[PDB]
Write a protein that binds this ligand. Structure first.
Ligand code: HEM
Ligand code: HEM
Lengths: 146, 146
């Protein structure tokens, strides 16, 4: 069975990703936390309220609320209410969050360099075409994926 | 995150496989049951004891014992002790098991025809090369997979 063969692989690869992240001290920056950190970092001119965060990650209000409170717990951001309207919550990347941001870019660079060692942009493009076609063949009517 | 993107896909594909199997009435023949049925079917000259079954699927004694008792429950096989030594258990495919065997070959034919529609042997070979390389890159020392 290739199903079970495939699941087991992704799980093992997730294991590797996680250890790699520990090693770079950019744990907890795997998924959505890292996305918000890199958003904040790259656009310091602009602000992000929690409402902006929901839209930027396409997540629900309660989920967003849990995320940012986790990020705050981690010390990556400060949550400061709009001085003009204290129902609006702004997120600001801390010193620690900016450190994590620069660490995260490094990590992502080395991770891809390691993972994609010995593999061409062509090979990848093929890979993507195959997966997407499979997905198409099997889903039929249900083809509403990523 | 491609991890979560990838897991979700395989899960959805498993969903499709399962419904396809129901439709062909070859449910429960997904994995190891189907392998033993097709082994029995293709080699009627030879016999398979439960001990042979363990070796043919590389599974433990207790696991094998559960499998074949499930297969018996399903009506796919008869479990009959060696007439000469009643500690040896032989498996025999029933009429229903032979029907399932011929159904299973059909199913597998149509499944691949559907899934691999619009995809070349080349594309596949590339796919396999990429996956295996990824696996190699990330596992390092731990490269002892399928
Ligand atoms: C936390 C995990 C990961 C994150 C956050 C992530 C994020 C990214 C980002 C932002 C890019 C865009 C690169 C660019 O052109 O600047 C990228 C590209 C890519 N990623 Fe990942 N990635 C992750 C894990 C993986 C994994 C596990 C794989 C495969 C196993 C993978 C394969 C790729 C490939 C093939 C590209 C395309 C390179 C290109 O077009 O230049 N990534 N990833
Ligand atoms: C219960 C599920 C499945 C079983 C039991 C199964 C079994 C098999 C077997 C026996 C073959 C050998 C074909 C031959 O040359 O005679 C095969 C080939 C193949 N299978 Fe599957 N398969 C399953 C599901 C899948 C899935 C889900 C995929 C991909 C999504 C897949 C992709 C392939 C490919 C690409 C080949 C190679 C064709 C060739 O070399 O001629 N299979 N499978």
């Amino acid at each position: 069975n290739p199903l079970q063969k495939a699941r087991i692989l992704v799980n093992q690869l997730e294991k590797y990703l996680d250890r790699y992240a520990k090693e770079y001290d950019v744990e907890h920056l795997a998924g959505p936390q890292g996305h918000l950190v890199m958003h904040l970092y790259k656009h310091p001119d602009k602000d992000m309220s929690i409402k902006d965060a929901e839209e930027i990650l396409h997540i629900s209000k309660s989920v967003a609320s849990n995320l940012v409170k986790r990020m705050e717990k981690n010390g990556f951001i400060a949550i400061v209410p709009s001085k003009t309207d204290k129902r609006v919550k702004y997120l600001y990347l801390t010193h620690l969050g900016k450190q994590k941001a620069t660490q995260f870019e490094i990590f992502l660079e080395k991770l891809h360099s390691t993972m994609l060692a010995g593999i061409t942009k062509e090979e990848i493009r093929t890979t993507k075409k195959v997966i997407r076609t499979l997905a198409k063949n099997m889903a039929m009517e249900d083809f509403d994926s990523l």
